[model samples]
Target: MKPPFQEALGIIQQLKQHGYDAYFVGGAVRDLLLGRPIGDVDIATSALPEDVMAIFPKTIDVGSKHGTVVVVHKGKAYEVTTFKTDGSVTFVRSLEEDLKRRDFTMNAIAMDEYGTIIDPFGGREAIRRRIIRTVGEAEKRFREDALRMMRAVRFVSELGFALAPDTEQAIVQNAPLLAHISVERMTMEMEKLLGGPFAARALPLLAETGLNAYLPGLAGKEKQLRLAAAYRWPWLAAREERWALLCHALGVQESRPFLRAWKLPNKVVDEAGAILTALADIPRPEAWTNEQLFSAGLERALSVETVRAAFTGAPPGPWHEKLRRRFASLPIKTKGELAVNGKDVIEWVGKPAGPWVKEALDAIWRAVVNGEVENEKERIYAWLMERNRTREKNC
Candidate 1:
């Protein structure tokens, strides 16, 4: 049982005492019914937005205009949405409906405070059968919002459910609609699809479904599909690893700037870009010189090795252990650990910042990595001044 769900359920019971109809809704219900870990338990109530806000002590108006509020209790979050007809429904079909306007049938289900299911569609049965179908017209749903195409694919990957044939076809027809979707929205779905246990499965599906064509940098590329699968990630790591691999294989090779084009965060870009760069280097760990290891760091080195292994269908070589031992023998692991700083360099040279200072630092790091010089401060300072003098004379 989910702690948050229980907490939210208790809240629902409290609200229901005042004769309010409160029901647990959305993904948490779906996951709970599937015996999977429940996420946030969104509560749907007959209470108006203002009334719900007044009832809950610590409530934040998430979408008061649309009748949604976030109620916090004991550090647990529960979204409580009032029964309000969406524009599509108010103008078109129902008087007041729940889950009918949702993108997928799986999400079009609700449960009361007592855990009683209120599935209007056969979502419960579909979940049992492990298939993802639509609550209503697939074409209409796709036309309503294009991002559902990506969401359909991602949900299938995440839940290990297969999309219904009509749903898949609708996705193809509405694939172009994703062009209008914001980078932030696309990134959320894309990142989840890439980083999960099903990423290997999802990558190929994206290509097969023709959705890749509309996504940034993935258009007209079959190699990305293969590369996404080829990219290796430990089963334990978060889905980001798989995403990084996908971006690296499909993106600008060494520049890694294309990741930013997709609106990926700098940290994700760095992690993914570094892996790609390290993968470009030869796979043998013994061949990994100190300079390379120092530059790449342990995380990148391991990830690159893993990817290279996955690339060739080969296991890690004997040099893996040897390389570990070699790194263990290093005196300093990073530039930050160097004995001298820029301030020391300034005091030694009696000068301001220049190309020479940066050059001196680089040389010191290189010397340390190469094991030609000790990491001692005095030695490094003397070495820097002498090197600058020699370079000046040569100039």
Candidate 2:
């Protein structure tokens, strides 16, 4: 095993030898300073963009225009950004321009290759006190880049930090600007906010900031804030039930249509839909069926059930035990586990790819699920023949 912090230190030393000062920066440093587990490593350097690219051959310019490079070392991509200030027609250049450009103080701090900090703002202090504050005037920074508003609450939820009073006020004042920002950008921040330790606080903050006002079809959902908070409890405690719980709070009605408006990934929207549907159908764990287990798959079904339990505000003890039992009792978790396929039903009924072929297959699967027929193809064929024979008089 590598010595603690040696990898990052060695990289810094190597960059320093090449006449560029490099140091670990960004979220990794912040997490370390907070005594929390590091998420990603971002290296800050004074190296000119081309020079840095030359030193690291296995690199991609993730955002060269923004002085950011992605270097693949040891099978992981590390983001190394050049230390420079950028500007627009609105703001003038200064020595601390980059520091001022950043959204939050805790993210604006920089450190040198020799472990020296270059905190133009009181980022370290803010981290120490567990607060989120702007690097400068919150309104101007947020106006220049509206995504910063979501980023602020993301950091708050992620770090469990209290939002500085001024910064919070600025977000409420500028929440309208988020509507002008790209849906994809806001969607990314919202996903991060959802996955944080303080998701309960984050969603409510979104509502309070009026972001929920124009969030596609999700307007006027103040009550959802409370429900989402309750669902978020399971995740805050690492109970693995939070994802599904949030879906329930959002409800089953047009959720896909709503989240899709934000350009959310199909996987998340689908799962959220499933969670909401499961909530209304199988409201209790004891009522869970093998068919539902088979249809939802083991992992997804467990997720759906756990969220249901959380929504009911019950201790996870009962649900946890049932999750174990339901997983073990699944007859067939996937379509591949079925002893028969489409071909079997088609051959049995001498029908092509028409609707009855599907009906025959569904009937067989249902018989197997109900324990009236075995999973073997011959048993299912016999079961289907009986059904067809029973209906022959209608023909």
Candidate 3:
């Protein structure tokens, strides 16, 4: 038994033993046929939700109203869904009817228990042609669910497949229907789209279908978006970095509202802000200051450097390694690690609680970071007192 389908096969075998028709279906089956690494194993069965619940000892009604149950088998969770029906108890009886109700021809294929192929639709041929086409009547399929438009573009990005001519026309026609979808759902789709291996190829379609107008801050910036799409998409470690790059490509000076329009988390907003700052200030990693590197942190620094390289065609260089070494060699990474504190600065300067206290501590921290003063209590105090005396004489 192949490890990928071992557990799924067991479930299917048990269902068939009970005289029910079950098969591996949907994206997992599509990926299996494509010889790509399978993600989640989804099973389509003729059993009703309650029947599925009875068959499996551990089950969750994740979407029972829509004929789905989560079966936890041997520490793995598999989504077991009943075939789509017209509210008939005998819904799973017509496997062909269930397959026909699917979104795309590529996802309409099914496989039975003995590794038998079942393709009433042209899913296998679509796979062979590397095409993304709806099962039948693209407009009707999209009218059934407008989110399928976004899914189509995402599949284009993910699988690096071309949209069939009819499918493309249907999407361009029904592009406005995406407005009915929620921002949260759109956010999920956009994130996956941006992170896909062939994101650059899929972005233009967003504009072509008028979907870009619906996305936050993407309209009226087609020129920049096209320019940004021209760059080889970097493997950004954080989603925030990718967002920052998109903003940079859009020539967006203010990223707060742009990111907020997508309802991104505050942490992501703040991190993206930091990345934008680095991109704006330092043209290259070789010119970054110790303070800059320390403050932005290594990850953001590296992300900015890579994006710059992509835009300018500059060699990525060993700059990332060099910056890594510099960061590792830092005496203290943050203010908390400094040998002196605000109270110590106040005591040494004999100053009352005021802005002077923070100013004096910051001065000492900078001095230590610059390697002009050692991170020693006695040296730091003496240095601060000397600075105060110098300022007083100047005054």
Candidate 4:
């Protein structure tokens, strides 16, 4: 047993001593059975919230009404939820009764303090077979919470498991119910699916189940989704990279609006959108110009080239690291890093501040980027004077 699992067993033992039944349940149990590194360990117990709070010295009432409380032990917090029947959380029920309402058979297994397994729903078998199957009737569980449908596909990519045939059919039949789920929740799951190691497999499943129609920016994009999935190898490891590739594969003209429609975070929207824009004229990492790299910054540039490499079916590596570093440390990366400011430009040009200040600065950075002028205040001033004289001479 691991440190956290050992600690959780102590909680179960404490509950048992107090005349309550408790066991390690949910994903922790499934992952433990599979020998995968478990995340948060959940304890399902016959102890009511009030009882758990009383037994545990340091307990946070996460949701007593939901029959859950966070018990802190050894600097780790474990969510202890009470076992309840199918109908409601108010009544303390048997562990089997509690497991009966879980989303999937893979998550329905539980383990006692003696490392004894309880397999009423065959969750351990599902884990061993690498299958994601619903606990009860698939429609019943999905109609109970439509987000579970998306989670089913997410499990495919996340655990590299296949959805049970019946489970997939139910999702295909009830796919439209996902429309009722919040955009934020759908986007959250979409990010994980795309970031998963087996995204190539999960993406097509999303389309096959017809869930893509409800997902933002993915409607009627079956061919594009399949195309993206086909090229997905050396799995894209970041959410922004995957989003950029998905958008590019789908031929989204403007990535920002599409990502914004999905209610993604402002930071991801900006980063992915910038990478898409950077890839507009420059098709691949080898084609990214110095000005493009400098303007997009190193992070967005890296994301852009990564997507391009995927599209071209090139092997993934830090092939552009030297170029990225060289451009990132250019004479000036952004307008803020310019040697001269708007005030300096206004003072030098003898004109009131206006849009021309921007034009002047743009010209200065272009010159600096092109190595036409040094990025020093005195040198920039001389360069400005020389450019003015040249313009006058040409005129």
Best by TM-score: 3
Structure candidate 1, residue pairs in collision:
195-239
User: Relative to the true structure, how large is the alpha-carbon lDDT of every model?
Assistant: 0.74, 0.70, 0.82, 0.83
- Model 3, 1-395: lDDT tens digits are 35778777878988888888798888888898998898688899988889889988999889898888999888899999888853323355788988998888888998888877799998999999999999889998888788888989989888988999989999888888887888888888888888888888878777777677777778767666666677666555569867887788788889889888888889998888888888889975678887788777778888888777656666566878888899887777877899988888777767688987777777777788888889999998788778778988997
- Cα displacement (Å) at residue 118, model 1: 1.8
Order by lDDT, highest first: 4, 3, 1, 2
Instruction: Check candidate 3 and list the clashing pairs.
Output: none
RMSD of 3: 2.1
What CA root-mean-square deviation does each model show from the true structure?
A: 3.7, 3.5, 2.1, 2.2
lDDT preference between candidates 1 and 2, better one: 1
Candidate 2, which ten residues in sequence have the lowest lDDT sum?
Answer: 86-95
TM-score of 4: 0.92
- Each prediction's number of clashing residue pairs: 1, 0, 0, 0
In Å, residue 211's CA in model 2 sits off its true spot by: 2.6
Off by over 4 Å in 4: 86-88, 316-318
- Which candidate tops lDDT? 4
Q: Give the alpha carbon lDDT tens digit for every residue of 99-214 in model 1.
A: 77776777777887666788888888888888888768988877777888888888876888888898888777777888888878888898777655676677788877868878
Q: For every model shown, what is its TM-score relative to the native structure? A: 0.85, 0.87, 0.94, 0.92
